[PDB]
């Protein structure tokens, strides 16, 4: 890999610089290089990985939606061709992230905090594949997302408090999966509501700073429930 010659510490340092510079493709390439060194990612480093690829794939998803809308409106080959180009690039990014998780972040994740984080990511990047998938490939991809999300949920409920921000962000995203991908809006509402209520009932245990962490994601659960009910 092109980052194979760079020190792990230098890659992490440059990922943080790339974030400051809003250079998210660079950030992701640096974090890919860091992962491929084969050592643990810290909590901070996991967040750097997630930030980098979420920004990369976010730009791709937004472009894909614009082109897909134009394509649907028009129903020459150019719109389809360019949508397919963006789609292929998006799928490649998701494949890369899933490859890092499977080789070997997840199996080497030696506690619940780290394993839940990576399994949430697995669900997210299968979800992004599902958004652009069609037909029978779509069904298998949807099942892979659900399975990863569900395993993360099982661990998080056993090992993390209901206000833990990774647990909350996992539940938020699994609820979006249910509503937008799985045509299960009732499941989506049930999950967002129980997650919100159980976080609220646990806020009394938190410091001012942890309170701010948890209420930030609670806000997003509330916004979805307001959209859905």
């Amino acid at each position: 890999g092109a980052m194979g010659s760079m020190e792990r510490a230098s890659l992490i340092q440059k990922a943080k610089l790339a974030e400051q510079a809003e250079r998210y493709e660079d950030m992701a390439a640096f974090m890919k290089g860091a992962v491929e060194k084969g050592e643990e990612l810290s909590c901070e480093e996991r967040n750097l990985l997630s930030v980098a690829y979420k920004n990369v794939v976010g730009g791709q998803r937004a472009a894909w939606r614009v082109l897909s809308s134009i394509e649907q409106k028009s129903n020459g080959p150019e719109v389809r061709e360019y949508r397919e180009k963006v789609e292929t690039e998006l799928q490649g990014v998701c494949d890369t992230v899933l490859g890092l998780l499977d080789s070997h972040l997840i199996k080497e994740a030696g506690d619940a905090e780290s394993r839940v984080f990576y399994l949430k990511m697995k669900g997210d990047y299968y979800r992004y594949l599902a958004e652009v998938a069609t037909g029978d490939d779509k069904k298998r991809i949807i099942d892979s997302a659900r399975s990863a999300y569900q395993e993360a949920m099982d661990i998080s409920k056993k090992e993390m408090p209901p206000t833990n921000p990774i647990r909350l962000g996992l539940a938020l995203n699994f609820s979006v999966f249910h509503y937008e991908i799985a045509n299960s809006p009732e499941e989506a509402i049930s999950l967002a509501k129980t997650t919100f209520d159980e976080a609220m009932a646990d806020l009394h245990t938190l410091s001012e700073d942890s309170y701010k962490d948890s209420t930030l994601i609670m806000q997003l659960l509330r916004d979805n429930l307001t959209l859905w009910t």
């Binding site: 997630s50 930030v51 979420k54 976010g58 997210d124 909350l168 962000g169 938020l172 995203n173 979006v176 509503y179 937008e180 994601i217 997003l220 916004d223 979805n224 959209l227 859905w228």
Partner: peptide, 6 residues
């Protein structure tokens, strides 16, 4: 579209 955590 709904909000997700990023």
């Amino acid at each position: 579209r709904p909000s997700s955590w990023r």
